Amino acid sequence: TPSMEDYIKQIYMLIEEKGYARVSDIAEALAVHPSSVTKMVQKLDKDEYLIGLVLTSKGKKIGKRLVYRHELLEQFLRIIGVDEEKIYNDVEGIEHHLSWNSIDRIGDLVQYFEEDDARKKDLKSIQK
Amino acid sequence: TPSMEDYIKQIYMLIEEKGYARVSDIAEALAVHPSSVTKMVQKLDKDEYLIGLVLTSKGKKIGKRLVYRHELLEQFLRIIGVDEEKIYNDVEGIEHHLSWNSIDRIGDLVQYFEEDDARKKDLKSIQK
Ligand SMILES: [Mn+2]
Ligand SMILES: [Mn+2]
């Protein structure tokens, strides 16, 4: 689910940032009460994404994938000229509704612009 | 809301297709129970999107924009080479989570590829 992915992402990011994931930090990162974190952490444990709390290899794999996908979509929206202020909220929504196929094709397109700057200028010219 | 956008879009599409929007057709289009439809219909009436379901001018403007947005994003995923079978499901989800700014820039991106087929060919080459 979207929520589960939001949690796994924030947990992975805290562990990379701090070395551990506190319930209070997850709650602060997701703007939720810790009782919701506690209840969700018990599901993630049940579904073997985690064992403070430690991500299993399964949990680590998904976390890293979600971070990559967020970063990819940010650079996609940035490349096509979306106002920087708007990018995060858009990515945070759309990330959960894109198939791997779309993600990978968005990947190729990001690569398409990056390998020749003229392409970027031509895209900019249309926006005029 | 996302749900409200789904309903307004489907109502607009039925009126364009058939000339009218019956609650039973709405229910089938969204695969929901009629009571869910009637609840949203009253909400849309209260919010002056509609009044024998008839869109007010406010309702038509939004309906037309939502149909446009859907088509645009289908075209976007299609151009970048997403498997046709996967496109509709992805668009159905992301359409609610993109700012107008993102939609406009995606519009520019679609225009970018549509105006020179060589650009499409160059993108497909990268995909190899
Ligand atoms: Mn998110
Ligand atoms: Mn939808």
3-state secondary structure chain B: CHHHHHHHHHHHHHHHHHCCCCHHHHHHHHCCCHHHHHHHHHHHHHCCCECCCCECHHHHHHHHHHHHHHHHHHHHHHHCCCCHHHHHHHHHHHHHHCCHHHHHHHHHHHHHHHCCHHHHHHHHHHHC
In this structure, are residues B18 and B8 in contact, taking their beta carbons and an 8 Å threshold? no
Chain B residues close to A81, C-beta within 8 Å: 105, 108
Secondary structure (3-state) at A109: helix
Resolution as reported, in Å: 1.6
Q: How far apart are CA B101 and CA A86, in angstroms?
A: 8
Q: How far apart are CA A70 and CA A5, in angstroms?
A: 11
| Nearest Cα residue to A79 out of A51, A108, A55, A53 | A108
Q: How far apart are CA B72 and CA A57, in angstroms?
A: 39
Domain end (from B17, B36, B66): B66
In this structure, are residues B90 and B77 in contact, taking their beta carbons and an 8 Å threshold? yes
Q: Are residues A77 and A121 in the same domain?
A: yes
Domains contained in chain B, number: 2
Q: Are residues B125 and B91 in the same domain?
A: yes
Cβ A80–B109 below 8 Å, yes or no?
A: yes
Chain B residues close to A80, C-beta within 8 Å: 105-106, 108-109
Closest partner residue to B97 among A81, A94, A102, by Cβ? A94
Instruction: Compute the radius of gyration of chain B from its Cα atoms.
Output: 17
Domain end (from A14, A37, A66): A66
B78 touches chain A (CB under 8 A): no
User: What does each C-alpha distance from A101 to A104, A111, B80, B122 come to in angstroms?
Assistant: 5, 15, 10, 19
| CB-CB neighbours of B71 under 10 Å | 12
Distance A128 CA to ligand 2 centre (A): 30
Neighbouring-strand partners of residue B73: none
Distance of residue B65 Cα from the nearest chain A Cα, in angstroms: 18
Q: Are residues B56 and B72 in the same domain?
A: no
Distance of residue A101 Cα from the nearest chain B Cα, in angstroms: 6
Structural domain harbouring A102: 67-128
Q: How far apart are CA A119 and CA B112, in angstroms?
A: 9
Q: How far apart are CA A25 and CA A16, in angstroms?
A: 13
Q: Are residues A2 and A59 in the same domain?
A: yes
Q: Are residues A37 and A87 in the same domain?
A: no
User: What does each C-alpha distance from A51 to A7, A29, A107, B82, B102 come to in angstroms?
Assistant: 14, 20, 32, 37, 39
Q: For B18-49, give one letter per residue: b (16+ CB within 10 A) or e.
A: eeebeeebbbebbebeeeebeebbeebeeeeb
Q: Are residues A100 and A80 in the same domain?
A: yes
Q: Are residues B29 and B44 in the same domain?
A: yes
Helix A84-94 × helix B84-94 angle, to 10°: 120
Q: Are residues A46 and A78 in the same domain?
A: no
Distance of residue B53 Cα from the nearest chain A Cα, in angstroms: 31
Greatest alpha-carbon pair distance for chain A in Å reads: 53
The tokens 């080479």 sit on which residue? B81
Instruction: Compute the radius of gyration of chain A from its Cα atoms.
Output: 17
Q: Are residues B60 and B71 in the same domain?
A: no
Secondary structure (3-state) at A50: strand
Q: What is the CATH number of the domain that holds A54?
A: 1.10.10.10
Experimental method for this entry? X-ray
Secondary structure (3-state) at A55: strand
Cβ B126–A119 below 8 Å, yes or no?
A: no
The residues, ordered by sequence, that sit 6+ positions from B91 with a Cβ below 8 Å of its Cβ are B70, B73, B74, B77
User: What does each C-alpha distance from A75 to A16, A71, A109, A114, B40 come to in angstroms?
Assistant: 21, 6, 11, 10, 37
Q: How far apart are CA B90 and CA B81, in angstroms?
A: 13
Closest partner residue to B80 among A90, A93, A109, by Cβ? A109
Q: Are residues B62 and B3 in the same domain?
A: yes
The torsion defined by the Cα of B20, B21, B22 and B23, in degrees rounded to 10, comes to -170
Q: Are residues B58 and B80 in the same domain?
A: no
Q: Are residues B16 and B45 in the same domain?
A: yes
